[PDB]
């Protein structure tokens, strides 16, 4: 159970979570619980995951993001994925998860 | 790494996979592996997962199903989820994965 570094910055109406590392079976449980806790103790209405440094995701990772999106909405927050690298934009289009996730080009746009 | 048993039946234009057990982190890799191989052998155009005995799915499980749908289509096949229990119907709705999966009420309807 390896990498996964979270750099969180809150400004405007956004809680920006810069994710370093890939989101896969080795750190998806860690990702879920950090986001879980953060969502419960932030005043911001939008939670933006800045994936600019994420190059890979596996099925465990996609499943975790899907449920985190749900947990966020349960909490009354908007969840957005921003600054995807082409490999991830690719994976989301192929699996049609782009029909579920709100996705912006840049974090500022969210 | 516990349960998971696949009862496969081919008839008509479809390959019916009766899944016994839960689709979770403990057997999602196995699930993906059997389906992968099956999808590569069968001549049926439709692959139907009869989930009537599946009571639970976790994030690893949902993520696996999403990529199996993808791999299925890659192989030119139709992938369908059928006979869901309400717990599962519930989860797919909450996560909005019902926007991705073709789901039928019964296996015969697929």
> Which residue in this structure is represented by tokens 């690298």?
A85
The alpha carbon of residue B15 and the mean position of all alpha carbons in its chain are separated, in whole angstroms, by: 11
Domain residue limits at A84: 1-110
Q: Which of B25, B69, B99 sits opposite A100 (nearest CB)?
A: B99
Is residue A30 within 8 A of residue A64, CB to CB? The reply is: no
Is residue B17 within 8 A of residue B49, CB to CB? The reply is: yes
- Based on the structure, what is the number of domains in chain B? 1
Q: In what order do the strands lie in the sheet with A14-20?
A: A5-11, A14-20, A46-53, A78-82, A102-104
Is residue B6 within 8 A of residue B17, CB to CB? The reply is: yes
CB within 8 Å: B95 and A95: no
| Cα B10 from Cα A104, distance rounded (Å) | 43
Q: Using CA atoms in the order A77, A87, A22, B93, what is the torsion angle rounded to 10 degrees? A: 40
- For chain B, give me the number of helices (H) and strands (E)? 3, 5
Chain B, 18 to 77: residues with Cβ < 8 Å from chain A are 25, 28, 32, 58-64, 66-67, 69-70
Is residue B14 within 8 A of residue B46, CB to CB? The reply is: yes
* CA nearest neighbour of A28 among A65, A56, A53, A77: A65
Is residue A19 within 8 A of residue A31, CB to CB? The reply is: yes
CATH number, position A65: 3.30.750.24
> Which residue in this structure is represented by tokens 């119907």?
B89
Residue of A nearest to B98 (CA): A100
Interface test with A, best of B32, B58, B59 (most A CBs within 10 A): B59
| Cα A87 from Cα B22, distance rounded (Å) | 31
Structure determined by: X-ray
| Cα A65 from Cα A71, distance rounded (Å) | 10
Interface test with B, best of A63, A72, A101 (most B CBs within 10 A): A63
């Amino acid at each position: 159970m390896n990498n996964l570094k979270l750099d969180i910055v809150e400004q405007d109406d956004k809680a920006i979570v810069r994710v370093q590392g890939d989101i896969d079976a080795y750190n998806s449980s860690e990702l879920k619980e950090q986001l879980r806790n953060f969502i419960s103790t932030t005043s911001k209405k939008k939670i933006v995951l800045d994936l600019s440094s994420v190059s890979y995701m596996d099925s465990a990772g996609l499943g975790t993001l899907v449920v985190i999106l749900k947990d966020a909405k349960i909490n009354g927050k908007e969840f957005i994925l921003s600054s995807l690298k082409e490999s991830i934009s690719r994976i989301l289009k192929l699996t049609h998860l782009d029909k579920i996730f709100k996705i912006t080009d840049t974090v500022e746009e969210a």
